[PDB]
């Protein structure tokens, strides 16, 4: 159930730092979406790829960033 992790509030896209560097993506998903996660940095977006059914990926359905 993989994809870009999501801002659980406004459901704006979750922006990662310099693309390529799969360090911040990893870290971030580690310390919010669980100490067993993984991912990498696309074009200013953290695609995380180690996730469970109870990972949602951007946006939210019922409250995307309007």
From Swiss-Prot:
GO annotation terms (biological process): defense response
Disulfide pairings: 12-65, 16-41, 25-46, 29-48
Molecular function in Gene Ontology: sodium channel inhibitor activity; toxin activity
Compartments in which it is found: Secreted
Domain of life of the organism encoding this protein: Eukaryota
Domain LCN-type CS-alpha/beta: 1-66
GO cellular component: extracellular region
Serine amide PTM positions: 66
Keywords recorded for this protein, A-Z: Amidation, Disulfide bond, Ion channel impairing toxin, Neurotoxin, Secreted, Signal, Toxin, Voltage-gated sodium channel impairing toxin
Tissues/organs with expression: Expressed by the venom gland.
The family this protein is said to belong to: Belongs to the long (4 C-C) scorpion toxin superfamily. Sodium channel inhibitor family. Beta subfamily.
Domain commentary: Has the structural arrangement of an alpha-helix connected to antiparallel beta-sheets by disulfide bonds (CS-alpha/beta).
Note: Is neutralized by the single-chain antibody fragment 10FG2.
Function: Mammal beta-toxins bind voltage-independently at site-4 of sodium channels (Nav) and shift the activation voltage to more negative potentials. This toxin is active against mammals.
Protein's name in the database: Beta-mammal toxin Cn2
């Amino acid at each position: 159930k993989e994809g870009y992790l999501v801002d659980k509030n406004t459901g704006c896209k979750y922006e990662c730092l310099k693309l390529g560097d799969n360090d911040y993506c990893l870290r971030e998903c580690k310390q919010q979406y669980g100490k067993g996660a993984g991912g990498y940095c696309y074009a200013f977006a953290c695609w995380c790829t180690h996730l469970y059914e109870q990972a949602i990926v951007w946006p939210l359905p019922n409250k995307r960033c309007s």
